[PDB]
């Protein structure tokens, strides 16, 4: 369908006190490939991120309405938004447009703005919020990404394990997909800092 | 004081002067009376002759609201003709909805809603005419209600409106109107108007009567010329 038009994938995981996010860089049209330099992950501010996949237009559209309503909430209240609260914003934003729906599969991961407490979740094409404390995968290669994650996922792992874990997850999974691949961006969210690495993958 | 400059402004004594002036505007109108009895409701109207140039039947103050509902008005004539079309369009919307003729209690209530709606705001003015709404039905019988500039319904066995009022109301109280029949009501209605009006300012007039009841088969109908003149001749006995 149109969700498979531009392809792409987004993956996110949670460690013990930390969370991890990784996604492919590929941007193309159907069978034709265009450019590998596209960015599917945008910073939401301190200790919070959001991923997006599916139609690339709504990825660059819906995400722009985020910081719009986000700043208005960050200007009125002197605190940053909670990731549990931000999930309600995107679900409400998709259900104002529900009738002729945007095309995307949001992915939200971060920490409790209050302290260290991690939280992760993902949404649906129609705007249904879904809270999963293990991992979230979205994209055209989704069915291929599950088996890799669920096999290698563990409840509590240090950032060192999360490095290789989601990496090896993405690598073998994204292989078997035709419309996803060719570069990977990885985001690691720690308490006092943030780690961001680039993975070497097959160009195909 | 400036407290009478608008209807939305209340008097320091707790009165509304603009609506009271509308009642005083009715006091400038010619005298009109109506009476209900067992057979039906009888109407009458004093029609003033301003000049001979007027055609017979001109300046008609008898309005037909609906099949079973007639109306007689006293006040500014055009304000009544404008509301008459409002009442006709209202009774028409009723039958178009519920599929039968609106009863007099229902129609006089919704018209009073339109009358009082214009007394509420400052952007409009109240009606300068007080009118009577008669009806007859086999389900109800002879019914007569009265609406005023304040938009309040008043049922009456007999009533009088226009310039001379209290004098005609007392004459109606002197004789029971419920026992008499519509055939004999037009006799007294004619005799009263001759007693009400004397020649001082105005010169001549004519009697305008209306019939609703069993004799009209439950339909608003004007008085025929033969019976009207016959009842006037019996009323001329008091004049001679």
């Amino acid at each position: 369908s149109i969700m498979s038009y531009n392809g792409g994938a987004v993956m996110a995981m949670k460690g013990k006190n930390c969370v991890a996010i990784a996604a492919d860089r590929r941007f193309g049209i159907q069978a034709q490939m265009v450019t590998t330099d596209f960015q599917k992950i945008f910073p939401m501010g301190d200790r919070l991120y959001i991923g997006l996949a599916g139609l690339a237009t709504d990825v660059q559209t819906v995400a722009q309405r985020l910081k719009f309503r986000l700043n208005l909430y960050e200007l009125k209240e002197g605190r940053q938004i909670k990731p549990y609260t931000l999930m309600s914003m995107v679900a409400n934003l998709l259900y104002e447009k529900r009738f002729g729906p945007y095309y995307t599969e949001p992915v939200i991961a971060g920490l409790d703005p209050k302290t260290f407490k991690p939280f992760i979740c993902s949404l649906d094409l129609i705007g249904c919020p879904m809270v999963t404390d293990d991992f979230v995968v979205s994209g055209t290669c989704t069915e291929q990404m599950y088996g890799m994650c669920e096999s290698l996922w563990e409840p509590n792992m240090d950032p060192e394990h999360l490095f290789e874990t989601i990496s090896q997850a993405m690598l073998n999974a994204v292989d078997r997909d035709a419309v996803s691949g060719m570069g990977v961006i990885v985001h690691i969210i720690e308490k006092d800092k943030i780690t961001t690495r680039t993975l070497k993958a097959r160009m195909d | 004081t400036g407290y009478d400059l608008s209807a939305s402004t209340f008097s320091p004594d707790g009165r509304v002067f603009q609506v009271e002036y509308a009642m005083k505007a009715v006091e400038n109108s010619s005298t009109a009376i109506g009476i209900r009895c067992k057979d039906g409701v009888v109407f009458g109207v004093e029609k003033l002759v301003l000049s001979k140039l007027y055609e017979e039947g001109s300046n008609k103050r008898l309005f037909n609201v609906d099949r079973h509902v007639g109306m007689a008005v006293a006040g500014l004539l055009a304000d009544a003709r404008s509301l008459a079309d409002i009442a006709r369009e209202e009774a028409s919307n009723f039958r178009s909805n519920f599929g039968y003729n609106i009863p007099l209690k229902h129609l006089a209530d919704r018209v009073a809603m339109y009358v009082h709606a214009y007394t509420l705001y400052s952007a409009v003015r109240p009606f300068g005419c007080s009118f009577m709404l008669g009806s007859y039905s086999v389900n109800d019988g002879a019914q007569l209600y009265m609406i005023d500039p304040s938009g309040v319904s008043y049922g009456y066995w007999g009533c009088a409106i226009g310039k001379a009022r209290q004098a005609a109301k007392t004459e109606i109280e002197k004789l029971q109107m419920k026992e008499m029949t519509c055939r004999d009501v037009v006799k007294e209605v004619a005799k009263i108007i001759y007693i009400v009006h004397d020649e001082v300012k105005d010169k001549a007039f004519e009697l305008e009567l209306s019939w609703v009841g069993e004799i009209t088969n439950g339909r608003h109908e004007i008085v025929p010329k033969d019976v009207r003149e016959e009842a006037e001749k019996y009323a001329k006995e008091s004049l001679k």
């Binding site: - | 209340f10 707790g14 509304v16 304040s150 309040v152 009456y156």
Partner: protein, 236 residues
Amino acid sequence: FDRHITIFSPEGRLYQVEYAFKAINQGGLTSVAVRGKDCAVIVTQKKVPDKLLDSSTVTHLFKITENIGCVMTGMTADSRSQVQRARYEAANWKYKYGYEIPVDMLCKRIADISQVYTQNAEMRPLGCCMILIGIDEEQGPQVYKCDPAGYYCGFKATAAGVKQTESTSFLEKKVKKKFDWTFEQTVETAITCLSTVLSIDFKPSEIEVGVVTVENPKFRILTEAEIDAHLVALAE
């Protein structure tokens, strides 16, 4: 200037609203109501200026819904307007929430309609006070009185009209004695109130008495034949 339209007076008053309070008082009719243990009674002055007028054609007791009665005091022009508007609400309540509207919300919605008249300078307050009665399954008998200003509160014994000052005093004298609350004996208290104030001994057609009970939540109007029974035979 402030004495004409509705704007804040230098003393904090509202003269357009206060001149309305004299307009309810201008109607020349005194109304009283008492909330009993098992019942709530309303007694108002029924005036018939001329014999040509008819009884059932002019009445001060209106029915908002089956279980809620209404009495009105003031210039009748504003009387019929609120009742139709109240029936547009009470009926709308059932279309939305699906049950008979309580007396609490009915007085709240009617007040909000009257509150706009005071806040919005385009319109004017209405010259009739509204006393709404009824019964609920929790608080039992409910008696409220809504002024044109929009204020309403639970009144054990309420009064209105020219004699309201003298009526309130006699209503206090009965409650000061901790008067035992029974149905018909309370109906006397509301009737004897207006009877002792004016020093008349009214005829049965000169008063209009509504009633509501726990046994009969549907509002009823006391028959004039039953009025004559409890006037003459029981004056005691």
